[PDB]
Amino acid sequence: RADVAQLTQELGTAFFQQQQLPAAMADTFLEHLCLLDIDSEPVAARSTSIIATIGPASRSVERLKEMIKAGMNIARLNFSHGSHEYHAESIANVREAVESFAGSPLSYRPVAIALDTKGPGSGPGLSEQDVRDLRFGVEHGVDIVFASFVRKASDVAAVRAALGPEGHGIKIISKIENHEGVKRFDEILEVSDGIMVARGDLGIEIPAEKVFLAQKMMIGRCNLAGKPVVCATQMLESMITKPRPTRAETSDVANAVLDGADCIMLSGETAKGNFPVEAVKMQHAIAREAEAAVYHRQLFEELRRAAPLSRDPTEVTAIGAVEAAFKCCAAAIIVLTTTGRSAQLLSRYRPRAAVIAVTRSAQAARQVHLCRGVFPLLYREPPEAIWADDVDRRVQFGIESGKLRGFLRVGDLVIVVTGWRPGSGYTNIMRVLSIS
Amino acid sequence: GTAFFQQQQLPAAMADTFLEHLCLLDIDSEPVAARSTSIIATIGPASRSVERLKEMIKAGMNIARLNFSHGSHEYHAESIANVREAVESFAGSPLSYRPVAIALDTKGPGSGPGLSEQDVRDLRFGVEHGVDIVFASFVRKASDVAAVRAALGPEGHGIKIISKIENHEGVKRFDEILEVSDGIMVARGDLGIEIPAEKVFLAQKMMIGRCNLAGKPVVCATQMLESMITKPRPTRAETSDVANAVLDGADCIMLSGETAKGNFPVEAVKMQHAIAREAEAAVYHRQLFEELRRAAPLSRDPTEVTAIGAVEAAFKCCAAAIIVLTTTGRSAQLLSRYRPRAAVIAVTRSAQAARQVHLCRGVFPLLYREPPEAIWADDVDRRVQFGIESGKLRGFLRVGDLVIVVTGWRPGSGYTNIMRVLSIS
Amino acid sequence: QQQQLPAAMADTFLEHLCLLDIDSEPVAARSTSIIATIGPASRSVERLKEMIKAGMNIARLNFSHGSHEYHAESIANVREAVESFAGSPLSYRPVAIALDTKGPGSGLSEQDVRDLRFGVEHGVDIVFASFVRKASDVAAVRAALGPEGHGIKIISKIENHEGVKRFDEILEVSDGIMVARGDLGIEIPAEKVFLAQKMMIGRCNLAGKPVVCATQMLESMITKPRPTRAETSDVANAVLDGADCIMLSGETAKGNFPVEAVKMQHAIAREAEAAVYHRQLFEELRRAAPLSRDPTEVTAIGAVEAAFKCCAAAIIVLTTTGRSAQLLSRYRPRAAVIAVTRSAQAARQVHLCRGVFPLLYREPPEAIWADDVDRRVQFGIESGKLRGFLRVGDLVIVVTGWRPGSGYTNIMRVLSIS
Amino acid sequence: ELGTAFFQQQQLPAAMADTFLEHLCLLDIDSEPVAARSTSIIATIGPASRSVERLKEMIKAGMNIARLNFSHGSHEYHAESIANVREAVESFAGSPLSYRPVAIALDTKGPPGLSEQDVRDLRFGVEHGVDIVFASFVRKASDVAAVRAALGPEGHGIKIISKIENHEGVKRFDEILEVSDGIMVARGDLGIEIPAEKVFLAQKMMIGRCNLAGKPVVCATQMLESMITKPRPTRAETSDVANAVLDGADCIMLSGETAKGNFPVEAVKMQHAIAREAEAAVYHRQLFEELRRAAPLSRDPTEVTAIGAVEAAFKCCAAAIIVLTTTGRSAQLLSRYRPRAAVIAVTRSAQAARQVHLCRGVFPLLYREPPEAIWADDVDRRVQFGIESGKLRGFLRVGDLVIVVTGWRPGSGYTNIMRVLSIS
Numbered sequence A: 001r002a003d004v005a006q007l008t009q010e011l012g013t014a015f016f017q018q019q020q021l022p023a024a025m026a027d028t029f030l031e032h033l034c035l036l037d038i039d040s041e042p043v044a045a046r047s048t049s050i051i052a053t054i055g056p057a058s059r060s061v062e063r064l065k066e067m068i069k070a071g072m073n074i075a076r077l078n079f080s081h082g083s084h085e086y087h088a089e090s091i092a093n094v095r096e097a098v099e100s101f102a103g104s105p106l107s108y109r110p111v112a113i114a115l116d117t118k119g120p121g122s123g124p125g126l127s128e129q130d131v132r133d134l135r136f137g138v139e140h141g142v143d144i145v146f147a148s149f150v151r152k153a154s155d156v157a158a159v160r161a162a163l164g165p166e167g168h169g170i171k172i173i174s175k176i177e178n179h180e181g182v183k184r185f186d187e188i189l190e191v192s193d194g195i196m197v198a199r200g201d202l203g204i205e206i207p208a209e210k211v212f213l214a215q216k217m218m219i220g221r222c223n224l225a226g227k228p229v230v231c232a233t234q235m236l237e238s239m240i241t242k243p244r245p246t247r248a249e250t251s252d253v254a255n256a257v258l259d260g261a262d263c264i265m266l267s268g269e270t271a272k273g274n275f276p277v278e279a280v281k282m283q284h285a286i287a288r289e290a291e292a293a294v295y296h297r298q299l300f301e302e303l304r305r306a307a308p309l310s311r312d313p314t315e316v317t318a319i320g321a322v323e324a325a326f327k328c329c330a331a332a333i334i335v336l337t338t339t340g341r342s343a344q345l346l347s348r349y350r351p352r353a354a355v356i357a358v359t360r361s362a363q364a365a366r367q368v369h370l371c372r373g374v375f376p377l378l379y380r381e382p383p384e385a386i387w388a389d390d391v392d393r394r395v396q397f398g399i400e401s402g403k404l405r406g407f408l409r410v411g412d413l414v415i416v417v418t419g420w421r422p423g424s425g426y427t428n429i430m431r432v433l434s435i436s
Numbered sequence B: 001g002t003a004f005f006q007q008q009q010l011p012a013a014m015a016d017t018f019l020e021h022l023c024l025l026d027i028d029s030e031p032v033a034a035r036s037t038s039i040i041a042t043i044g045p046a047s048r049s050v051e052r053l054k055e056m057i058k059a060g061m062n063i064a065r066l067n068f069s070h071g072s073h074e075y076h077a078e079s080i081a082n083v084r085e086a087v088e089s090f091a092g093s094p095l096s097y098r099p100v101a102i103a104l105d106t107k108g109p110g111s112g113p114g115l116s117e118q119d120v121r122d123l124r125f126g127v128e129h130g131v132d133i134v135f136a137s138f139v140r141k142a143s144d145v146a147a148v149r150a151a152l153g154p155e156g157h158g159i160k161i162i163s164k165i166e167n168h169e170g171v172k173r174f175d176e177i178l179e180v181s182d183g184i185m186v187a188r189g190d191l192g193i194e195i196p197a198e199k200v201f202l203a204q205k206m207m208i209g210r211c212n213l214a215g216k217p218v219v220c221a222t223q224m225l226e227s228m229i230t231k232p233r234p235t236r237a238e239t240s241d242v243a244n245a246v247l248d249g250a251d252c253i254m255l256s257g258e259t260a261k262g263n264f265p266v267e268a269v270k271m272q273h274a275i276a277r278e279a280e281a282a283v284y285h286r287q288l289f290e291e292l293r294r295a296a297p298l299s300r301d302p303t304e305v306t307a308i309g310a311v312e313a314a315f316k317c318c319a320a321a322i323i324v325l326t327t328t329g330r331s332a333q334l335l336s337r338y339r340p341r342a343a344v345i346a347v348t349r350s351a352q353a354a355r356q357v358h359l360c361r362g363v364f365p366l367l368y369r370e371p372p373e374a375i376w377a378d379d380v381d382r383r384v385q386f387g388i389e390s391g392k393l394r395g396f397l398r399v400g401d402l403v404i405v406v407t408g409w410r411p412g413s414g415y416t417n418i419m420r421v422l423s424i425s
Numbered sequence C: 001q002q003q004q005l006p007a008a009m010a011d012t013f014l015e016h017l018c019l020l021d022i023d024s025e026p027v028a029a030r031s032t033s034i035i036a037t038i039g040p041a042s043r044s045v046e047r048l049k050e051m052i053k054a055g056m057n058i059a060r061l062n063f064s065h066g067s068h069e070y071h072a073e074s075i076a077n078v079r080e081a082v083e084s085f086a087g088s089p090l091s092y093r094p095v096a097i098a099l100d101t102k103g104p105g106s107g108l109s110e111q112d113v114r115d116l117r118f119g120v121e122h123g124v125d126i127v128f129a130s131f132v133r134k135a136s137d138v139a140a141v142r143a144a145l146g147p148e149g150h151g152i153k154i155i156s157k158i159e160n161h162e163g164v165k166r167f168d169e170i171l172e173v174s175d176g177i178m179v180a181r182g183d184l185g186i187e188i189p190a191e192k193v194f195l196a197q198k199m200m201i202g203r204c205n206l207a208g209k210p211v212v213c214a215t216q217m218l219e220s221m222i223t224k225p226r227p228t229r230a231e232t233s234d235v236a237n238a239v240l241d242g243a244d245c246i247m248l249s250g251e252t253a254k255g256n257f258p259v260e261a262v263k264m265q266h267a268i269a270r271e272a273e274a275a276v277y278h279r280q281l282f283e284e285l286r287r288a289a290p291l292s293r294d295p296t297e298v299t300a301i302g303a304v305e306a307a308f309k310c311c312a313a314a315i316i317v318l319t320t321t322g323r324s325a326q327l328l329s330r331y332r333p334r335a336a337v338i339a340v341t342r343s344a345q346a347a348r349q350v351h352l353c354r355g356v357f358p359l360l361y362r363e364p365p366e367a368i369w370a371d372d373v374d375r376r377v378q379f380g381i382e383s384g385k386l387r388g389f390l391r392v393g394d395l396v397i398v399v400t401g402w403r404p405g406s407g408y409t410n411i412m413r414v415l416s417i418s
Numbered sequence D: 001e002l003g004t005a006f007f008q009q010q011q012l013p014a015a016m017a018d019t020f021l022e023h024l025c026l027l028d029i030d031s032e033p034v035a036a037r038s039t040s041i042i043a044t045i046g047p048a049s050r051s052v053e054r055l056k057e058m059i060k061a062g063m064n065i066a067r068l069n070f071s072h073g074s075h076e077y078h079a080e081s082i083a084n085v086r087e088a089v090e091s092f093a094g095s096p097l098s099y100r101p102v103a104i105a106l107d108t109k110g111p112p113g114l115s116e117q118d119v120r121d122l123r124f125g126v127e128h129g130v131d132i133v134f135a136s137f138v139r140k141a142s143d144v145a146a147v148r149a150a151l152g153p154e155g156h157g158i159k160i161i162s163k164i165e166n167h168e169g170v171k172r173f174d175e176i177l178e179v180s181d182g183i184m185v186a187r188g189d190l191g192i193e194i195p196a197e198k199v200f201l202a203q204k205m206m207i208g209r210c211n212l213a214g215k216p217v218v219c220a221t222q223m224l225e226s227m228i229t230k231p232r233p234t235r236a237e238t239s240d241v242a243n244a245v246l247d248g249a250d251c252i253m254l255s256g257e258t259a260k261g262n263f264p265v266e267a268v269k270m271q272h273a274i275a276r277e278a279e280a281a282v283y284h285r286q287l288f289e290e291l292r293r294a295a296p297l298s299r300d301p302t303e304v305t306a307i308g309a310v311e312a313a314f315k316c317c318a319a320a321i322i323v324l325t326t327t328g329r330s331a332q333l334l335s336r337y338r339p340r341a342a343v344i345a346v347t348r349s350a351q352a353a354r355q356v357h358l359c360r361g362v363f364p365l366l367y368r369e370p371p372e373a374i375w376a377d378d379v380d381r382r383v384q385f386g387i388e389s390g391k392l393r394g395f396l397r398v399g400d401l402v403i404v405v406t407g408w409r410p411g412s413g414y415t416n417i418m419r420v421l422s423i424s
């Protein structure tokens, strides 16, 4: 009680009853479970991104607008099916639906476009079809590649080479789908931007009763590395034909978030099912409940104990900002970023505070959806003559969007993360600001 | 040997943090210990045949659930007879005989305020037919449990009452319900209709945590392997759900339509068995034991004091088993509440206690049938030897293993007070 | 490695003790301040210069002995010795002046009222108030200091059973506490003093307020050039307990080896500070420190967390009153807290907080406030390089505010030296 | 119930704390120690403490081990001091409530190899039946082997406590501890051989490693130095004694304080008073957790039984753990887990009864009844002897819970049973 008494008097007992805060203050994991409360409502914005596979059931512009409003952050295009012409039309429809909300950043929502490859088949390396599909991705400006059946580090180097010099900025998320991928996980993660636990093939390649071990291990190692991890396949499977999921399906979604997944995915549920929008809404509702139930006290302590010492100022500032946000129950951490890296380094410490990432790069704004708890804001104004004023305008842009979009209210504390000079790699400042 | 320390997720068990424990989980680290989470299979048209029941017992069914929401008393009495016939077909080999509990799951109160007249009749049927457990539907408060207990009468005092929590009131009045119940069932079917579907996992994890803290059995139920009612293999979400119920701390996992009416009853039991064994090896015992110890209050009860000493001793030597003599199952339950990795082999002469201890995780009941020796110390030794011989035959024990033996200072229940370190010869 | 770093990485306190190494040399500057009692043996300007060089941070004047004329001459000699090093601003060491009252004897005595008035007139920085037994005793001392002594720190001396029992109410209204073991060891059983000491140090560490361990720490050094094994152990254990300051009484006031006693406390404190198990200490201080909406409070925890992440050589903080440095000190960083201040009094008083190294800023003011802040930060860096705290390539954490004036600290910056 | 008053004594509010910092904050000067003093006191016998009458007062004050410093005196002088110790000890054999075994320890003069004088003094120790040797200036494992060889054919049961007095002993500590029965942190010479300001690091490290190895460790020299001439110690001296106990020392020592000082009895009384206070202030929650986590897994039934018995004693706040031991080993393995319950060791070996004083919290009871023909009856008689002695001495009352540790067959090395008994 003494460690929360003054803040309880100031913020109120009602504030400390919401978002599983009594369970968050527990001294043991067992006590944390015992304090979980179905009446404790989630307040924070949903931080785990939803990837929706785009197909016949979710192709139209009108349907895609509903999916964006329901919570879709990443549109996946499965190159195992369809054609280049079919997928290009789906991509154009996604972009049309996304841009229909570009009226003001107080209502704008960026959406990443991901290409999921067919894979190597019986062959041992990049398939000729994968080379053509990866070239298509670069030509159509995809943000992410979900590379199928990655079995070793040279597989991701081959994917990187097929993207050429013009696809240098595309994120490569390696899909682990077999025994070799699990066994060579460390070398694959080292050269990848992130990982997808592709449970469909994994559950056929290894005993079905061992998939949960591979999932928890890969999520834990990705959390330790500070790299995005996606949990995929059959999460809400029954929703392909039914309007409501099973008890095992809601449990699976909640447990993927509690495991530490940055993203959760919908495959047949959105590509061909009868309830694509309802499936997105269900993942959204479960993820908000599960994020509040995360035991941050042990998680943050373990992420600190395991993360090595760092002499990188972006990394040092990120841990200081997350520590400061927990100390004051900050509503948000506003960070200026060019490539998304400063937001990713904040996200790896799993703050409860939303990470509002203000960027001029449309691609970085789409790609940061891979990192849990990062809310991208695309800044469109031309640069101010004085760099310090251009920085301040970008911070104010995040404070006004947050104030008028629920995130922030007058009296809230926010942590602001900036650098000392223009350009990528110079984040080194953390500021505590009171919202007026 | 090095091979021993590579199996049963032992590298992940030695980790200094939960995060490093997850990072060390290995799909090639094979489970060695016997499956400790009990499987409850609901009886119906797909599982009533005496020959089909024999296959389900071999696959791992520990408790047979009779769902009184369907069928007459004549139907349930035939189910009881078929279950008992299949169980007793293995009684000719006492070292391998597996007791199977019979649980009666009530229809419930309906639009009524408390115990239905149908439940009063069904509960009296349960006592008359010797059921071991009652899964009481829609328990909303402590007086619902007292009413179930009263309907069982003086002849049903030994029947275990597991309260099913199926609505908001049951979740909110959980503490008072657990206090008077023998255990709890997280009845997710109705719970997921009574409260928002996205909140069920919070109610499940909370109730399992509180039951683990109280040392009382908790069952995770409904739609765990739902797709297996019509498909031979479950979905990725279903295997995950079963593994996570075990990781949460559930003593039992349940099958409903998967065994009552589906096309794969035996395979659904085999699937729960396979998943539970993998998930039990992945339990982070270092944190779990530490937290259970820290939260368990001080006690002046010798059974409770001996149990924590025996669990601490078992962890110190990597004991293959804790062999406990028990009359009511209580000494085995008090060992089980500390979640030892060592199997708790409970030797009992009570056929009912042998069936009921399946509610406690990691308790393997052995029904001892020999008449008592004239010298009490010799009768205790013969039972301990029966435990060792059954354990060797079933694969729990080998020569050279260390075992912890928990016994008492005089006959009758309530006098457990001794813990002994024994080398298997 | 140096500064007990293998013992610092240990996963348990037991393994930390097992890894302590007599060959692991201390590198960090000595964090625990030394209070030396000034008397016949340590009065001369030449002797005081050697005591400052040996490590004396606070000069204590015991008003139980001497006279106003005697103590005023001791104060003038301390100031003369301190100011003899002012010609080199990058290495100048401020020294606080503390007045220790005679006490109530058999409420606030008339002699204490006169002595407290003397302290205000002579510009003392701290009052060590004798025999504090309740909150109203502190209020009486505060009232006797009047309107001109509002800035003087009151450190309540706990010397009897009532002071121990009413500790919480005394700490609440005091700036800090002194565990006055001489009288405490007569007032309560001698074998219970260590319990009162460890409890008071723990509660002061929890409150983020300075605590002094005092009396008979190196007693045998009054006549002998080397202390006993129990005395070196006592000094090391007071530092390991969490004391912000350690004190010398007869050892410096009347003994034959005043300079050697200061040197011995300095040598032991440096060794003991490196042996502190920061992994458990920081985690416990962090877990127990309440949630806060005060930006100075929030910035301090962020800065200490950042310093541990990069093994920062120092945390450079700008402070008017010393408060921003005190809030960093309460988390016990391994990094030195270099406090750059224009207030000569705050520079002297900040010696009460463990690990705070005060730098008195005497350079011309900049016209642009941002440029003025930058030059005070570069002054912290140049003084740090000269004193051995910093080297080129080191990382430092810089803590500053958004606007001039006290109470506005809200910024933490990661800076690479040179 | 035990009552709220029970939970206010022996620093029990500080014992329940969830952090070490909270534990310190909850220490209470009004919380009185109830348990018997568990840290043995070693007193150096010299001119000021040699007489039978003075030795009787020192035994009553709390002396458990009599140290004879072979750096001074002679064989004749030390033999007379030993005879006086034995006469003073045996003067209490007519009262079970007052009788207490007292170990006799020989501290060598010290050293190329073992000195000629040390060979003769070690032979004197064997001939006079000493229990312990405090071996001066041990620098390496071969120094311990030389002392062991010198203990001739009749003295292999004598305990060798290696004194660490210089840089080489500190640096070769692990190899020395491996072959020694225990260690003495000999701070006098250590504070001359290494910088004085580093002695506390060597002390804390050696105590921690001995606690980890489950071997006795003695903190020695200048603990109450001023009491050689003054009736009361300094604030630094009481602090030093309390901190040696909090560090984890099994024994604390008095040298000039008892050998030649003006207040030998008062110095013993002061160490007794401080140790009792400091033992109650030990943070058992973290200590037991860390001893468990660091101690490797074991297939030795005595070690497995010991941890189970200590866990059981903490669970019920057992007044005592009664253990049957012939060599002292079963009591030593209980002691290494630092139970708050007193370890009452029932033995037929007079030497083991004296030597177990080296292990913190072991209260030896020498049993001299003739053996019963039925072994189970002889075991029950010794268990009841421990219970009746415990009731007589104030350790136990009817209604208390005790833990009893025995083995399954006679002879040393078979401990494998732990029982929970209600005192009737």
Ligand SMILES: O=C1c2ccccc2C(=O)c2cc(S(=O)(=O)N3CCC[C@@H](C(=O)O)C3)c(O)cc21
Pocket: A053, A054, A055, A056, A077, A078, A079, A080, A081, A082, A083, A086, A200, A267, A268, A269, A271, A272
């Ligand atoms: O791009 C698609 C697509 C493209 C063009 C026509 C139909 C589809 C389609 O039905 C579809 C279904 C799915 S799907 O429903 O997720 N699923 C169908 C069965 C096979 C699964 C597999 O790849 O193993 C996939 C998609 O992932 C993608 C598409």
Ligand SMILES: O=C1c2ccccc2C(=O)c2cc(S(=O)(=O)N3CCC[C@@H](C(=O)O)C3)c(O)cc21
Pocket: C037, C038, C039, C040, C061, C062, C063, C064, C065, C066, C067, C070, C249, C250, C251, C253, C254
């Ligand atoms: O101010 C002092 C002083 C002032 C003028 C003459 C002599 C002295 C002196 O000897 C002295 C000794 C000491 S002292 O050595 O610490 N000590 C002497 C004995 C009584 C102790 C007590 O107060 O209980 C104090 C001082 O603390 C201060 C002075």
Ligand SMILES: O=C1c2ccccc2C(=O)c2cc(S(=O)(=O)N3CCC[C@@H](C(=O)O)C3)c(O)cc21
Pocket: D044, D045, D046, D047, D068, D069, D070, D071, D072, D073, D074, D077, D255, D256, D257, D259, D260
């Ligand atoms: O056995 C003793 C003894 C035996 C015969 C005559 C005198 C003494 C004596 O004074 C004495 C003093 C001490 S002592 O007081 O501990 N001693 C003081 C001076 C020498 C020191 C040293 O050895 O470094 C320690 C003893 O340890 C032992 C004896």
Ligand SMILES: O=P(O)(O)OC[C@H]1O[C@](O)(COP(=O)(O)O)[C@@H](O)[C@@H]1O
Pocket: A336, A337, A338, A339, A340, A341, A342, A343, A417, A418, A419, A420, A421, A422, A423, A424, A425, A426, A427
């Ligand atoms: O997260 P990234 O990719 O390193 O970008 C962070 C960068 O953004 C800034 O805050 C502002 O940079 P710009 O003015 O170039 O947009 C820099 O100071 C910092 O280096």
Ligand SMILES: O=P(O)(O)OC[C@H]1O[C@](O)(COP(=O)(O)O)[C@@H](O)[C@@H]1O
Pocket: B303, B325, B326, B327, B328, B329, B330, B331, B332, B379, B406, B407, B408, B409, B410, B411, B412, B413, B414, B415, B416
């Ligand atoms: O677990 P419970 O029901 O308390 O049974 C434990 C009892 O079993 C025993 O070990 C054996 O007793 P019985 O010979 O009566 O079967 C008793 O000593 C002990 O009291």
Ligand SMILES: O=P(O)(O)OC[C@H]1O[C@](O)(COP(=O)(O)O)[C@@H](O)[C@@H]1O
Pocket: C318, C319, C320, C321, C322, C323, C324, C325, C399, C400, C401, C402, C403, C404, C405, C406, C407, C408, C409
């Ligand atoms: O520690 P204090 O007393 O609050 O002083 C800290 C203050 O110092 C500063 O860094 C610099 O202030 P000045 O320019 O007034 O000296 C402020 O921004 C900040 O509020």
Ligand SMILES: O=P(O)(O)OC[C@H]1O[C@](O)(COP(=O)(O)O)[C@@H](O)[C@@H]1O
Pocket: D324, D325, D326, D327, D328, D329, D330, D331, D405, D406, D407, D408, D409, D410, D411, D412, D413, D414, D415
């Ligand atoms: O501690 P030690 O020397 O191993 O002695 C323990 C032995 O004492 C006993 O409890 C009793 O043995 P004895 O009857 O021979 O004295 C044995 O069962 C056990 O092995």
Ligand SMILES: O=C([O-])C(=O)[O-]
Pocket: A148, A175, A177, A197, A198, A199, A200, A201, A202, A232, A233
């Ligand atoms: O490839 C996939 O996405 C899978 O198998 O889940």
Ligand SMILES: O=C([O-])C(=O)[O-]
Pocket: B137, B164, B166, B186, B187, B188, B189, B190, B191, B221, B222
């Ligand atoms: O009754 C049940 O088992 C349920 O609702 O899940």
Ligand SMILES: O=C([O-])C(=O)[O-]
Pocket: C130, C157, C159, C179, C180, C181, C182, C183, C184, C214, C215
């Ligand atoms: O006044 C003091 O310093 C004391 O009593 O210790």
Ligand SMILES: O=C([O-])C(=O)[O-]
Pocket: D136, D163, D165, D185, D186, D187, D188, D189, D190, D220, D221
């Ligand atoms: O020999 C000793 O005891 C010493 O040197 O401390």
Ligand SMILES: [K+]
Pocket: A078, A079, A080, A116, A117, A118, A119, A148
């Ligand atoms: K694909």
Ligand SMILES: [K+]
Pocket: B067, B068, B069, B105, B106, B107, B108, B137
């Ligand atoms: K039912």
Ligand SMILES: [K+]
Pocket: C062, C063, C064, C100, C101, C102, C103, C130
């Ligand atoms: K005074």
Ligand SMILES: [K+]
Pocket: D069, D070, D071, D107, D108, D109, D110, D136
């Ligand atoms: K000697």
Ligand SMILES: [Mg+2]
Pocket: A148, A177, A198, A200, A201
């Ligand atoms: Mg696949």
